[PDB]
Design a protein around this ligand. Structure first.
Ligand code: FAD
Ligand code: FAD
Lengths: 392, 394
């Protein structure tokens, strides 16, 4: 098999890169380890910055202006709830709520409608000859070892993908912080308790209220790492959730059986550079932010945007070396999103063995940022997403 | 001996409080462990927020600071070899800071106090406080071998971090919040013209450095140093060499150096007690809290505690409203914690901490990039640097 760009991973990153490359007449084949249904079973997040919404349209999808709303942000702490006027504070921008499952299903449909190639259940993917002019990928599909020749490989295979693991260790510098807690998330077929995303810092720990539609909700509470999802019945989750929200919010919460429940570990992770020879990492394969800041998929989007654009230029100009700037460009946006996601996480969660001083400083941090126009502006401008870097 | 308000400490806090009390007609006596000469030997800092300047004027001690204080419209931060200016007046909406030595501030208050003929007992050894929860609190000290007693209505603990007043409150009624930093500030006062008209905070791989000033021909510099260092191991030349090594080459270039007038190492710490009072005793300034100096807030916080204490005491004395003093701690703490947060923040982004991992160091660099390069970020530094607005009282 042969193509121009071999894409590893049919998650949002790989599917979006695939659409953009196709639109620009660049052949690509995507190889995905799991089944289509398995990929679609991932719930993940629901907040998109405007950079992403336009890119989706530009990629030939987003024809579902419905099933997809705009919402504001609220932070509850120490007995109060402060709404962040995103629109007024950020120069007219806002975020869109849209489940990652729907985004992914939307891109899967846009690819299928193009007849483009996607190989699901591609096992044992291995990358080869990254420094050569003819790199290739080997994999197994129902018993047979297949091979895919290409000019470039985009590793869009997530945190535990094979592509970051195919770059010689010594070429990479790794930055990582692993948080001492995870997010127990619950998807429910109930109307959301607010039309505002609600982040809550509470003595018992963090909680978050979000939504997917008028009758579908998404909630999270932080939990320690020794906790197992089977130890948390739906009822136990709802009780802990209420115990962490302002009673005004809590009394009006409609509960119901979970449609999906899982615990996600939190971590900040970055590699530099994010490429090696003909391989370019994008999204979670190259970096991870804790979901507190809702930046993951949005960063994946801009990585994909830059990659798409630098590839297009290289072909058009018959010059690969332009591709050398990919890492530097992406990294500038990555680090800002890492700082904001780290900040949000650090001010909103309860950490183990925090002394009195630390606890008060965290409280004062919230008071100042939620009570000062300048403070509020730093939050809103970062949350709606900073400017799409220059690229090229 | 008797007075209305006994003040422990003849540092800026106590002097400023005594001055305002004097001017409002309230009797007060300051008792001080050191000698004038000693007090005046402390160099410390030099940045004043406007609230402090107005209080000094209200205290009737501002003519000289008007003539000799340097007002800055900006402050500068250097990191990754690049000075970034923070236009304070523009970002804060018109506010500025004034550079004026604490020694000069202290000298001016002492002068004012001496002219007024107000009471100040230097070398008052072994001060011990008594009967705080009663109606007739009193203090005892030793002056030239004899033990004297000073009876009063209220006691102002303005004796600094190592004072005696915070320690006179039953420990179990107080809650302590502290953070001790893994470094101190080696400061050098020199009679050379400052390398810059603006203050320059520098985050550098070798560690923090600060370029400040006191006049067109008097300078003040600092470099962070580990806690195992002793000043005597730092000759003026070792200092100049390390400072230059931490500054933009373009700055280190023009640096005029010279013999130190004074040198010392200040360890950094954050410290807050709650509450800040007990019976007739009220703590103010460094006796109640400490902030690392990166934020230039300590004396300014001292000024606002005193301002608040003075105002409530006038109400108690000029209205018999004695239970109104119950709100002192709560009022002060609101400003205190805001200064503690900013001071801690400044400290964390500007200094090098031991065994900090790679992610943590990159995050520090990213924080600087964001706050010195985004309008909103810059604004949060500026509005905090010029001092947030004093509270309301009551
Ligand atoms: C609780 C939670 C909430 C979040 N909230 C948000 C939010 O609201 N907004 C936001 O922007 N981000 C959010 N995120 C992050 C976001 O979900 C990720 O950033 C996004 O999934 C990254 O997409 P991706 O395509 O890079 O990787 P993935 O979605 O991980 O997809 C990589 C794909 O590659 C496949 N693959 C893996 N290994 C191989 C292999 N060896 N061979 C072939 N294929 C392979 C995987 O099966 C997968 O389908 C959240 C994440 C979590 C955990
Ligand atoms: C390197 C450095 C730089 C700084 N830079 C600045 C700056 O630029 N801006 C700013 O706002 N702040 C700054 N500060 C903070 C400022 O120096 C202090 O916060 C300020 O001195 C508080 O003064 P005070 O009167 O409350 O206490 P102090 O100045 O400590 O005075 C307390 C007084 O009490 C006396 N005393 C102690 N114990 C007793 C006792 N038992 N009996 C009697 N008297 C007693 C002492 O001898 C002293 O005279 C800096 C501090 C340092 C260390």
């Amino acid at each position: 098999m042969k193509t121009q760009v071999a894409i590893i991973g049919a998650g949002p990153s790989g599917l979006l890169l695939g659409q953009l490359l196709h639109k620009a007449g660049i052949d690509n084949v995507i190889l995905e380890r799991q089944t289509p249904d398995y990929v679609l079973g991932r719930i993940r997040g629901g907040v998109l910055e405007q950079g992403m919404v336009d890119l989706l349209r530009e990629a030939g999808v987003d024809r579902r202006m419905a099933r997809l709303v705009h919402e504001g942000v609220e932070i509850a702490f120490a007995g109060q709830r402060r709404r962040i006027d995103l629109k007024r504070l950020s120069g007219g921008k806002t975020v869109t709520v849209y489940g990652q499952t729907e985004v992914t299903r939307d891109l899967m449909e846009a690819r299928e409608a193009c007849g483009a190639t996607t190989v699901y259940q591609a096992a044992e993917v291995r990358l080869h000859d990254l420094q050569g002019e003819r790199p290739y990928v080997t994999f197994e599909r129902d018993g047979e070892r297949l091979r895919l020749d290409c000019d470039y490989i985009a590793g869009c295979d997530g945190f535990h993908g094979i592509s970051r693991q195919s770059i010689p260790a010594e070429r990479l510098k790794v930055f990582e912080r692993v948080y001492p807690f995870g997010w127990l998330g619950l998807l429910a077929d109930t109307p959301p308790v607010s039309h505002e995303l609600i982040y809550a810092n509470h003595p018992r720990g963090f909680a978050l209220c979000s939504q997917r539609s008028a009758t579908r909700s998404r909630y999270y509470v932080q939990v320690p790492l020794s906790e197992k999802v089977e130890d948390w019945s739906d009822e136990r989750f709802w009780t802990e959730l209420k115990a962490r929200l302002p009673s005004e919010v809590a009394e009006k919460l409609v509960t119901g059986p979970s449609l999906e429940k899982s615990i996600a570990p939190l971590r900040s992770f970055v590699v530099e550079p994010m490429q090696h020879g003909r391989l370019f990492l994008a999204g979670d394969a190259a970096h991870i932010v804790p979901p507190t800041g809702a930046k993951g998929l949005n960063l994946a989007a801009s990585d994909v945007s830059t990659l798409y654009r630098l590839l297009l230029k290289a072909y058009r100009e018959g010059r690969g070396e332009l591709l050398e700037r990919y890492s530097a460009i992406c990294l500038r946006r990555i680090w800002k999103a890492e700082r904001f996601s780290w900040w949000m996480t650090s001010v909103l969660h309860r950490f183990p063995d925090t002394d009195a001083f630390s606890q008060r400083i965290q409280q004062t941090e919230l008071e100042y940022y939620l009570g000062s126009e300048a403070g509020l502006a730093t939050i809103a401008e970062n949350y709606v997403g900073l400017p799409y870097e220059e690229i090229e």
